[PDB]
C-alpha cells in the first residue's frame, strides 16, 4: 500500500559492469515458476526465479 517489500535474492560476484547494462524478459508460468531471463553484452545469459 505505502512501501516496497524488498527482498535480496542474491549478493555476490555475478561479474557485472556499468559499461554493459541489463536487458531482461520475464515470464509468468504459474505461482511458483516466475522467471527473469537477462543478458549482458559481456557475460553469459542467465535466469532467476
Amino acid at each position: 500500500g505505502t512501501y516496497f517489500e524488498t527482498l535480496i535474492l542474491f549478493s555476490g560476484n555475478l561479474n557485472f559492469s556499468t559499461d554493459y547494462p541489463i536487458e531482461s524478459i520475464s515470464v509468468y508460468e504459474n505461482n511458483n515458476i516466475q522467471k527473469v531471463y537477462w543478458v549482458d553484452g559481456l557475460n553469459q545469459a542467465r535466469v532467476i526465479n
Binding site: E29, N30, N31, N32
Partner: protein, 49 residues
C-alpha cells in the same frame, strides 16, 4: 494348450511338435488399466494461467 493330443490312451506318436503346443495369450494380466502411488508433498503444478 491348444493341441488335441490330451488325455488319450495311445500317446504313441506324441512329441514336442504335437503334445504341448501353447498359446501364450491366455496368460495375460490386468495390464490395460494400471495405476500407481502419488506423493502428497511433491509439487506438481495444476494451474495454467
Amino acid at each position: 494348450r491348444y493341441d488335441k493330443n490330451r488325455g488319450q490312451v495311445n500317446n504313441l506318436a506324441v512329441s514336442p511338435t504335437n503334445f504341448n503346443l501353447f498359446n501364450p495369450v491366455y496368460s495375460q494380466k490386468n495390464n490395460f488399466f494400471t495405476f500407481r502411488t502419488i506423493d502428497y508433498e511433491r509439487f506438481s503444478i495444476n494451474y495454467f494461467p
